[PDB]
Amino acid sequence: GDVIEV
């Protein structure tokens, strides 16, 4: 899956 850091 993805790693999303915002």
Side-chain angles (χ1 to χ4, degrees):
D2 304 319
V3 180
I4 298 173
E5 271 276 7
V6 289

